[PDB]
Design a protein around this ligand. Structure first.
Ligand code: HEM
Length: 399
């Protein structure tokens, strides 16, 4: 059994193994870091099955859950939030915060998202490009998602820059285990204080809703409001940062796609849909443990055996998406949907918010900077290490 995670074929490409497994052995076993075996599903149809089956469990404490690293095993002991819950507890907790993430709530959030994006682009314009290229990640890609999520949670405006920097520390590769954990408690400590405030004097934010509707009524504890708040902040922020950078790098790679977008910004939604399929920035999140014997294809997964469904592989499934390795914003979409944000009950709570943020970024970026270009040769872009999810560490740009 080959060890998993697999390494990406190159900077922007998915692991080479998936294409082979899809063709010759769709449901197979891989070897995890601790020597244990898990089943890997690679076909779109099977990933959808794994994400919806009632015979499969998301509980991380269950012996058999496929942890991918030693640290992941230590994180499994902490008190679970809805992300690690099965029905009926899952929707019970997820429904407490989901109202802010609905399609309509996000539609009413558009003027704000647009304003935030405009302001950061304006700052980057004042910052200058005179003494050399700017890092698009620290100056734009990082602040955009952070300020928004922080503001939705309830963080004061003047605290955004410092808090955005700290959250970046947790996921920074050049960060010691020391620095990462001190950043975690810093944020955790701040959220707990914010919870104490909103209980006294609530506001128009996610924390005040939790305090008013769940904490006061005795539905959940104070520390529960803190854990949910923290989950919402750390869950997909790093992924959003990467998606923005990946979008810019992808447009530099295909001048034709860029030309179209510049000519018609209204194509941003189409660009965003293809980007989330093509670049599956979160490919190791759909993991389950069989609660009972289940047959997937010609395999039979026994009770208590772990499963990892690759949505990245599913997004490149020739059987579903024609010319899956070609990046085409003008692609004709099949009835089956891309799995960039998951599938089933655990499908990303922030899917609509994420797409709104990305659509605003890509329908504005090139209108502000029509001559924006990656200053380093494409082959030299500093992508994340091959053994992990696709991303870009820094992106020098001129405009
Ligand atoms: C474009 C960026 C994003 C991508 C590609 C992404 C992707 C994913 C994926 C693949 C899953 C699905 C796992 C499953 O099906 O079980 C997921 C779950 C989740 N995401 Fe994201 N996400 C993004 C942005 C966000 C943001 C901004 C937030 C924060 C508000 C967030 C919060 C969550 C949470 C809380 C879950 C767990 C939902 C549940 O288990 O019910 N994600 N995300």
């Amino acid at each position: 059994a080959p060890s998993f995670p697999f390494s990406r074929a190159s900077g922007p490409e998915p692991p080479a193994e998936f294409a082979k497994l899809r063709a010759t052995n769709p449901v197979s076993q891989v070897k995890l870091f601790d020597g244990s075996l898990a089943w890997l599903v690679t076909k779109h149809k099977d990933v959808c099955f794994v994400a919806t089956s009632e015979k499969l469990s998301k509980v991380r404490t269950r012996q058999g859950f496929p942890e991918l690293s030693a640290s992941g095993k230590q994180a499994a002991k902490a008190k679970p939030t809805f992300v690690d819950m099965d029905p009926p507890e899952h929707m019970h907790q997820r429904s407490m915060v989901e109202p802010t993430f609905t399609p309509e709530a996000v539609k009413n959030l558009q003027p704000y998202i647009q304003r935030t994006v405009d302001d950061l682009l304006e700052q980057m314009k004042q910052k200058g490009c005179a003494n050399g290229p700017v890092d698009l990640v620290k100056e734009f890609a990082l602040p955009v998602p952070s300020y928004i999520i922080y503001t939705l949670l309830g963080v004061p405006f003047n605290d955004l820059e410092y808090l955005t920097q700290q959250n970046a520390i947790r996921t920074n590769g050049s960060s010691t285990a020391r620095e990462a954990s001190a950043a975690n408690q810093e944020l955790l400590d701040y959220l707990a204080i914010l919870v104490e405030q909103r209980l006294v004097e609530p506001k128009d934010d996610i924390i005040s809703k939790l305090c008013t509707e769940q904490v006061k009524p005795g539905n959940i504890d104070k520390s529960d409001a803190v854990q949910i708040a923290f989950l919402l902040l750390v869950a997909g922020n790093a992924t959003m940062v990467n998606m923005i950078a990946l979008g810019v790098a992808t447009l530099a790679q295909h001048p034709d796609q860029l030309a179209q977008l510049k000519a018609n910004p209204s194509l941003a939604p189409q660009f965003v849909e293809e980007l989330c399929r093509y670049h599956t920035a979160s490919a190791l999140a759909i993991k389950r443990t069989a609660k009972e014997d289940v047959m997937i294809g010609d395999k039979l997964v026994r009770a208590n055996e772990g499963i990892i469904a690759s949505n990245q592989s599913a997004n490149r499934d020739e059987e579903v998406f024609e010319n899956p390795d070609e990046f085409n914003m003008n692609r004709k979409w099949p009835p089956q949907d891309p799995l960039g944000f998951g599938f089933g009950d655990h499908r990303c709570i922030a899917e609509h918010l994420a797409k709104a943020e990305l659509t605003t970024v890509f329908s504005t970026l090139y209108q502000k900077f029509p001559d924006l270009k990656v200053a380093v040769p494409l082959g030299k872009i500093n992508y994340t290490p091959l053994n992990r999810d696709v991303g870009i560490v820094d992106l020098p740009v001129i405009f």
